[PDB]
Structures are given as structure tokens and as C-alpha cells.
């Protein structure tokens, strides 16, 4: 969970449990060639790799073998009309290596006008012989 105060744990205390998870993640096509067992996710910044492992293992029942994380810096170079820097949000990227020899590949997602088209068909482009003379007149 994010944007919530974690109940402070003291030795011998109860297990910390989150019932309504606040984290929402994205599965993103890698920008570079990746091993067949690796899945790339975009994650909330406050989520740990342990949290991601538990999240995937519980909500999705995905057997996770390893998790690595890196914070990708968002560009702060673009400037608006007022010359004020526009910050692309920094995000977190997690690489999850599946277990039990399981393999994953990003699926191949994404595999009046009639009058306009018919008038374009009926354009009747002016012939060179007409020499710019309007051809509408029947004479």
C-alpha cells in the first residue's frame, strides 16, 4: 500500500497485513532484447521487490524466481511556453524472472466519410485540354 502510514512493528508483534492493495502495476514490452523468462513491469515508486514478488504470487499466482528493480529518471529538459521545465515523472522498472522454466513473451496487441470518399472519387479532375476553362457549362 502507498500513501498510508505503516503500523510501526515492535519485536514479537503481529504480521503486517495489507488487505486492499493500493499498488497498481503495468506490464510493459521491453525496449531491448530480454531473456524468455524475464517480464518487465512499471511499478509504483514505493513498492519493493519483495512486495512485487508477493503481489504477483498472491494476486496472479505467478511463480516468481527473481526480481530486480531500477528507478528510471524522467526527463526534466522539456520547457513550456513560459520556459518552465516540464518534468516527465520518474518511474520504477522491475524485471521479474519466472520460475519452473516458465517462459513469457509480450503478446502482439493491436494485430459523412462515405460522402467525402465518393466525392473524392467523383472529383473529375480538369483535363489539360480545357486549359483552366470551367468544364461545368454544357456549351
Amino acid at each position: 500500500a502507498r500513501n498510508v502510514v505503516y503500523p510501526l512493528y515492535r519485536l514479537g508483534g503481529p504480521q503486517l497485513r495489507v488487505f486492499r492493495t493500493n499498488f497498481f502495476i503495468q506490464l510493459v514490452r521491453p525496449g531491448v532484447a530480454q531473456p524468455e523468462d524475464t517480464v518487465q513491469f512499471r511499478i509504483p515508486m514505493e513498492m519493493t521487490r519483495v512486495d512485487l514478488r508477493n503481489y504477483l504470487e498472491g494476486i496472479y499466482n505467478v511463480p516468481v524466481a527473481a526480481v530486480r528493480t531500477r528507478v528510471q529518471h524522467g526527463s526534466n529538459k522539456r520547457r513550456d511556453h513560459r520556459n518552465v521545465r516540464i518534468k516527465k515523472p520518474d518511474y520504477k522498472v522491475a524485471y521479474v524472472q519466472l520460475a519452473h522454466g516458465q517462459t513469457f513473451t509480450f503478446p502482439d496487441l493491436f494485430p459523412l466519410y462515405s460522402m467525402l470518399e465518393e466525392e473524392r472519387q467523383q472529383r473529375q479532375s480538369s483535363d489539360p485540354r480545357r486549359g483552366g476553362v470551367p468544364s461545368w457549362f454544357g456549351l
Binding site: 503500523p7 515492535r10 508483534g13 504480521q15 486492499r20 511556453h81 460522402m115 467525402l116 472529383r123
Partner: protein, 191 residues
């Protein structure tokens, strides 16, 4: 939206609207009389009569209502003509485009008299709020699915499974799922 944004015919978030009103424009604000929400009497679908300009007297149907500028668009009325699809070579095609009309320039029409009428927001015991024509009486009426795989059935959505109890969702779910926790939360200091 940016302050003093000039509402136009295009919706306030379309490509055309962004093109016409980029963030840096500072055009003079348009003066519009302050018609209260409880005094607005033109609605989408109302049959209206044009009082001024070309096609004055003709009665049409309101197609759009840009309330922020006291505008009503009468379908196929108050029309100029513009070219759509005009490319470098093709001249394009002529299309009739409606222009906005002010509520002062437009008046509602009696449902049966088919004549312009002045209107009042008179309360009625049955129709708590409804329009009433003044010059000839009568109330002008206000004009106006298959479940998918991820859509709940109506009966399921309306099933009242809630049992008012003094248990938090956390402990209720713990009881439901059988999670057993014996450790007692040690006290902490708040400040």
C-alpha cells in the same frame, strides 16, 4: 482550463480546440450576461424559433448547448458553408456548418401552437419544476443493453449482502479467510 479560456464551437479538449486556444493565448474575454442555472430555459432537443439573422422565423431543433457562452446550436439552421477535406489538389466538399445563436436571439416553441413563447419556471405540485408558457399557458416538456463478460447482472449488483456489524473490514476478512493471529500489537508512542 486556462483562465479566461474562450469557449468555442469545438469541445474544450479536442485537437481543434487545442489548435485554436493554445496555452499561451490571452484574448479578450467575451462578455456574457449571467444567466443563472435556475433560469436557463433552453435544452438540447428543444424546438426553437430564430428571431434574428438569416433564417429568422424558421424553427429548428437545438443540437448543442454551449452554456458557458449562452449558446444554442440549431441543427441545419443559421448555416454558413465550409470546405471539408480540402487538400493541396482537391478543392474539398461544401458542407453546411451551423453558427451559435444567443438565447436572447432564440425563443422556445409551443408544443402545439408552433409559435414563439415566453417561458417561466413555475413550480407545479406534481412537476415540482417545469417550464410554463406565459402568453398561452401550457407546459413545454423537457426533451431527452446487453451485459458484457465483465458486467455484473442487475440482480447480483443489487443483492444486499451487507450485514451491518461493528467489525472493521480487516477483521471481518480475517474471520472469513480463517487467518489466525495471536501476537498482540505492542503499544507505540504517537507524536
Amino acid at each position: 482550463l486556462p483562465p479566461h479560456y474562450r469557449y468555442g464551437m469545438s469541445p474544450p479538449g479536442s485537437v481543434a480546440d487545442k489548435r485554436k486556444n493554445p496555452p499561451w493565448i490571452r484574448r479578450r474575454p467575451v462578455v456574457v450576461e449571467p444567466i443563472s442555472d435556475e433560469d436557463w430555459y433552453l435544452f438540447c432537443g428543444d424546438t426553437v424559433e430564430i428571431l434574428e439573422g438569416k433564417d429568422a422565423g424558421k424553427q429548428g431543433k437545438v443540437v448543442q448547448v454551449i452554456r458557458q457562452r449562452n449558446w444554442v446550436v440549431v441543427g441545419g439552421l443559421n448555416t454558413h458553408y465550409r470546405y471539408i477535406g480540402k487538400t493541396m489538389d482537391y478543392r474539398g466538399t461544401m458542407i453546411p456548418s451551423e453558427a451559435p445563436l444567443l438565447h436572447r436571439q432564440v425563443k422556445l416553441v409551443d408544443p402545439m401552437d408552433r409559435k414563439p413563447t415566453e417561458i417561466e419556471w413555475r413550480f407545479t405540485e406534481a412537476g415540482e419544476r417545469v417550464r410554463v408558457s406565459t402568453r398561452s399557458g401550457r407546459i413545454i416538456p423537457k426533451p431527452e443493453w446487453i451485459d458484457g463478460p465483465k458486467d455484473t447482472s442487475v440482480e447480483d449488483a443489487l443483492e444486499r449482502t451487507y450485514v451491518p456489524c461493528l467489525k472493521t473490514l480487516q477483521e471481518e476478512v480475517m474471520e472469513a479467510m480463517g487467518i489466525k493471529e495471536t501476537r498482540k500489537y505492542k503499544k507505540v508512542y504517537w507524536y
